[PDB]
Structures are given as structure tokens and as C-alpha cells.
Amino acid sequence: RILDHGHLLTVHDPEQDSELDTVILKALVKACKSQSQEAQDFLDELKLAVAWNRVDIAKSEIFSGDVQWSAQDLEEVMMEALVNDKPDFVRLFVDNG
Amino acid sequence: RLGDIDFTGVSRTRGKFVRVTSSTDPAEIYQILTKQWGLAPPHLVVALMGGDEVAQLKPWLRDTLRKGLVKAAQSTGAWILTSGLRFGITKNLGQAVRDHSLASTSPKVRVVAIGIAPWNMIQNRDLLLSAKPDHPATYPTEDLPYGAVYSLDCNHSHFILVDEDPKRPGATGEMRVKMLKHISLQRTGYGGTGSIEIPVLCLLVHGEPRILQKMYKNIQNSIPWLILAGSGGVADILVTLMDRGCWDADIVQELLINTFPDGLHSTEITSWTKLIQRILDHGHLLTVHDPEQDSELDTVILKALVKACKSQSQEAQDFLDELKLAVAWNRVDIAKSEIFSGDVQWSAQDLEEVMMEALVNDKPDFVRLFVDNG
Amino acid sequence: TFQVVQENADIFWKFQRYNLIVEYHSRPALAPPFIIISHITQALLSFIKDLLERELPSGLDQKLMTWETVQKENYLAKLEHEHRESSGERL
Numbered sequence: 001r002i003l004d005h006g007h008l009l010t011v012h013d014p015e016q017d018s019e020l021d022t023v024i025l026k027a028l029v030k031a032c033k034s035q036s037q038e039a040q041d042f043l044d045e046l047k048l049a050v051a052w053n054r055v056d057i058a059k060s061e062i063f064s065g066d067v068q069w070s071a072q073d074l075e076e077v078m079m080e081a082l083v084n085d086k087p088d089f090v091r092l093f094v095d096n097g
Numbered sequence: 098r099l100g101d102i103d104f105t106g107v108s109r110t111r112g113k114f115v116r117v118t119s120s121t122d123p124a125e126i127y128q129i130l131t132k133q134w135g136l137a138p139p140h141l142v143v144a145l146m147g148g149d150e151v152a153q154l155k156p157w158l159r160d161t162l163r164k165g166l167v168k169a170a171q172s173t174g175a176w177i178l179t180s181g182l183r184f185g186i187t188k189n190l191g192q193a194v195r196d197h198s199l200a201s202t203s204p205k206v207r208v209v210a211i212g213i214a215p216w217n218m219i220q221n222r223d224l225l226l227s228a229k230p231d232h233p234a235t236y237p238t239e240d241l242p243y244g245a246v247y248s249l250d251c252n253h254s255h256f257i258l259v260d261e262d263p264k265r266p267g268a269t270g271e272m273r274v275k276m277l278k279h280i281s282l283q284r285t286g287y288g289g290t291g292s293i294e295i296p297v298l299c300l301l302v303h304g305e306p307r308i309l310q311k312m313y314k315n316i317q318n319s320i321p322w323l324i325l326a327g328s329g330g331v332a333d334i335l336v337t338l339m340d341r342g343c344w345d346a347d348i349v350q351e352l353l354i355n356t357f358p359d360g361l362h363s364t365e366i367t368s369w370t371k372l373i374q375r376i377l378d379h380g381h382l383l384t385v386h387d388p389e390q391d392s393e394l395d396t397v398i399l400k401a402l403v404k405a406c407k408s409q410s411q412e413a414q415d416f417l418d419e420l421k422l423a424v425a426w427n428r429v430d431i432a433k434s435e436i437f438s439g440d441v442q443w444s445a446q447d448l449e450e451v452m453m454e455a456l457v458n459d460k461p462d463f464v465r466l467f468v469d470n471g
Numbered sequence: 472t473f474q475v476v477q478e479n480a481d482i483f484w485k486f487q488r489y490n491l492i493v494e495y496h497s498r499p500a501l502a503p504p505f506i507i508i509s510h511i512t513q514a515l516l517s518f519i520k521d522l523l524e525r526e527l528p529s530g531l532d533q534k535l536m537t538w539e540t541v542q543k544e545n546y547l548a549k550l551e552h553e554h555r556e557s558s559g560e561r562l
């Protein structure tokens with residue numbers, strides 16, 4: 001049954017991955033994607049992505065066509081990226097509405 | 098029905114227009130466009146289809162699309178066909194064309210944003226009804242929500258306003274298809290003692306199931322189509338179906354329902370499924386532009402036009418406009434790979450005009466290619 | 472000292488030339504002693520009644536701003552294209 005779920009399980013190989021924040025973010029994003037498609041549920045994953053400077057993961061998964069993002073949904077994370085000096089995420093948020 | 102418009106608002110812009118009916122000959126409208134307005138026969142016609150839905154493009158996608166289209170159109174004289182209403186991707190494309198016109202120091206080649214809009218969708222149409230030859234009609238610019246009635250985009254220089262047809266309420270699409278086909282059949286004079294066709298391409302961004310009939314009509318008229326990968330609607334359906342490689346009734350209906358919840362009708366969904374099935378069945382007239390992967394609109398446009406020409410005929414005289422576009426865009430690799438392969442036979446007299454064009458415009462790679470090819 | 476200045480001689484001289492041209496562009500056309508005539512004329516004109524730093528009409532100003540924005544976009548696009556084809560990026 002555990003494997004039958006699958007989407008809630010991830011493998012961290014320090015030989016291959018060696019970056020725990022990337023794997024953690026990927027696992028949380030996968031769980032959220034399998035859970036729901038609303039943008040309000042991706043806000044904490046987005047905050048973690050901003051804090052870890054994982055712009056590529058956010059672009060690939062969080063800001064894909066599956067999830068619809070509004071301008072008002074991104075105001076708080078825009079402020080977080082601005083105050084914390086994350087220009088890549090500022091550019092991404094401008095690009096996404 | 099020939100009238101001028103003085104746009105009041107941010108900037109004093111001038112615009113001409115012509116009211117037309119659903120039964121008008123596209124030849125007369127082309128004649129008016131060429132002689133009565135002075136627009137030289139274009140070297141590339143890009144028709145914008147879709148983008149009028151409430152679901153708009155993402156700012157990065159919209160900016161990339163408009164910038165790439167304008168830069169591809171800036172090399173030669175190009176007409177950009179949109180629904181000239183101030184809304185959606187049409188407004189932003191008009192803004193980009195306007196910005197290029199302001200920033201252009203070479204008025205020899207021009208990018209013209211020609212709008213074809215319903216007469217029943219123009220806000221304050223009675224205001225521009227006057228259209229006195231001495232006094233151009235004053236038209237106010239108003240930004241409005243999705244709604245059902247817009248105002249003419251001030252950044253579109255020329256307009257073709259088509260009245261509603263009493264028989265069927267689809268005059269705009271039919272007029273657009275007729276104009277595109279008539280332009281595609283045109284043959285402007287080339288250099289000396291020569292004539293060339295006008296490359297016509299259709300760009301689809303976030304189509305709704307309603308334009309499927311017009312899209313299939315344009316496909317039947319052998320007009321190539323370009324599809325934005327992440328556009329939002331029917332475009333994702335088409336790109337996903339091509340990515341899978343096979344399209345069947347079950348998968349087509351599943352994707353159609355998944356991306357369009359509101360559409361629920363057995364006969365209508367069957368018609369849409371069959372339409373899409375035929376559209377993909379053509380295939381050679383369809384291309385995918387993924388800004389993540391391609392990111393160079395001129396390359397994709399040239400590849401689409403060359404593919405359409407190859408599937409059409411093998412004569413070199415039909416490849417002359419594609420060759421001119423390749424020369425203007427410095428796409429020597431595409432020309433060598435496709436245009437100058439063994440399939441098409443090229444003569445020395447066929448290449449004289451393009452040789453002069455490459456020589457005058459400082460394209461040494463194309464000069465070398467033409468020397469290499471006869 | 473000579474080596475340090477001579478390395479940037481072109482820039483230093485061009486700045487000097489700018490300053491000298493600006494200084495003599497804003498000077499009265501008459502040389503002293505005669506400059507008294509120019510001073511008297513200027514004072515009389517002030518009592519009785521530019522090549523650089525000019526104000527533009529709104530339409531021309533907006534056109535110039537859009538032209539400069541387009542130039543900046545082209546410059547940034549060329550920079551991005553140069554970056555993409557670099558050896559490190561390809562690697």
C-alpha cells in the first residue's frame with residue numbers, strides 16, 4: 001500500500017542529489033500537486049522555494065500551466081522576495097502576473 | 098464608406114477604415130488596401146487568431162510573443178492581421194507595433210497592424226459613423242472589461258469593419274478566411290520581370306471551440322498555422338495531441354472536456370472532435386512554437402512556411418518568397434537544409450533577384466550559398 | 472604617476488575637452504577688455520526685457536523614450552544571446 005500511494009514518497013540519494021532542500025521542495029510540491037490545484041495551497045511551498053533560491057523548481061512545477069496564479073495571490077511572496085533580495089523570484093512573479 | 102479616425106487619448110493617432118458586408122469580394126478590399134491606402138504588397142502576412150478570451154496570456158508569454166512577432170516582421174514589409182479591438186493580445190500586439198513604428202528610423206519597410214473587427218462590437222460606432230473626408234471622425238479610447246463590446250485599438254493603423262450577416266451570425270470569420278485566401282493567391286511583382294507570392298501564416302493563441310470551423314477552413318485553403326505551446330486553450334489540446342503522436346476520438350473528447358468544462362453537448366462535441374481530427378490529419382500545415390524550446394519566432398515561421406511550400410509543390414518559383422524571408426532573417430542553415438536540398442531544382446536565372454537582394458543587404462552567407470547553388 | 476595617467480590618457484583628455492568646450496560655449500563672444508561691451512549688453516537686455524539641456528514637446532519626448540526603450544531591449548537581447556552561446560554556458 002505504501003508504494004501504491006507513491007506520490008507521497010521520495011528518495012534522497014546523497015551520492016546523486018546531495019542537496020536536501022531541492023529534494024524536500026520537490027517532495028512537498030509533488031504532494032501539493034497530487035492534493036489540489038488551487039494557488040492558495042502552493043503558498044507555503046512557494047515561500048520555501050523563495051527562501052531556498054530554487055527558482056528553477058518554482059518555474060518548472062509551481063508556475064506551470066496546471067496551477068492558475070492571480071496577481072493578488074502573489075503580493076505577499078512578492079514582498080518576501082523583494083525584502084529578502086531574491087531578484088530571480090521578483091522577475092518570475094512579474095512574469096507570472 | 099472610406100473614413101479616417103482621429104484617436105483622442107494618450108497619443109494623437111490616425112486611422113483609416115472601410116465598412117464592408119459579408120458578401121463583398123475580397124479582391125475589392127485588397128485593391129482598396131493596396132492602391133486606395135498606399136500599403137505596398139506585403140512580404141509576409143501574419144493573421145492573429147484567438148486571444149480574445151477572458152483567460153489572457155501570462156506577461157512573459159505575451160511580451161515574448163509580441164516582441165518576437167514585431168522583430169520578425171521588422172525585416173520586411175509585413176501585415177499583422179488582428180481583430181482590431183482594444184482587448185486581449187490584440188491590444189498588446191498593437192502596442193508593440195506602435196513602439197516599433199516610433200523607434201523605427203527606416204520608413205521603407207513598414208509593419209502594419211490591420212484590424213478586422215465586427216461592426217456590432219465597436220463601442221461608439223455611431224461616433225465614427227460621420228467620417229467626413231475633410232474632418233476625420235473623433236474616436237475616444239476606452240479600456241473595458243471582457244464584456245461583449247470593445248473600442249477600436251488606437252495603435253492599429255487600418256481597419257476593415259464587417260457588418261453582421263443576416264443569414265448567419267459569423268460574418269467576421271468568413272471575411273477573415275476570404276481575405277487570407279485572396280492574399281495567399283496574390284502574386285506581387287518581384288524586381289524585374291518577376292513575380293512572387295505573399296507568405297501567409299496563421300498564429301493561434303488560446304483558441305475556443307468556436308473558431309474550429311474557421312481554423313479548418315483556413316487549413317483547407319492550404320494556409321499554414323502556428324500554435325503557441327502554452328497559450329491556454331485549444332492550443333494546448335493541439336500541442337498535447339501532437340506530443341502523443343496519435344489522436345483518437347476518446348482522447349480528443351477527454352482533452353476537450355478537460356480543458357473546456359462548459360462545453361457539454363453530444364452533437365457539438367462530436368463536431369468539434371471531427372474538426373480537430375481533420376485538422377491534425379492535415380498536419381503538415383501545423384507547427385508548434387514553444388518559447389521555452391524554440392524562443393526564435395522567425396525560425397519557426399520560416400520552417401512552417403517552407404514545410405507548407407514543400408508539401409504544396411516542388412517548383413523553385415514557389416520557394417522565392419520563402420527564400421526572401423530566409424535572406425532577410427539570416428537563416429542560411431534553414432535555407433541550405435530545406436530550400437536548397439535535392440528535392441527542389443534551382444536554376445541560375447531563378448536566383449538572380451535573390452542574389453541582388455543578398456548582395457545589396459550584405460548577406461555574404463547567402464551570396465556564397467547562391468554561388469554554390471548555380 | 473605618468474604610467475597610470477597615460478594608460479587612461481584618452482578618457483582624461485576627452486573629459487578635459489568636454490569641460491573646455493562647455494566653458495567656452497557659455498562665455499560671451501567678446502574677449503576682455505572688450506567683454507565689457509557684452510556685459511553691458513546683457514545687463515541692458517535683462518533690464519529692458521540652448522544647444523544642451525533643451526525641453527522637448529510631449530509627443531517627441533514620448534517618441535524618444537520609446538525609442539530608447541526599444542534600443543535598451545535590443546541591447547539586452549544581444550547580451551542574452553551572447554551569454555547563451557558562450558563556452559561556459561554551452562559546457
Ligand SMILES: [Ca+2]
Pocket residue numbers: 032041042043044045
Ligand atoms: Ca501546501
Ligand SMILES: [Ca+2]
Pocket residue numbers: 294296406415416417418419
Ligand atoms: Ca511560397
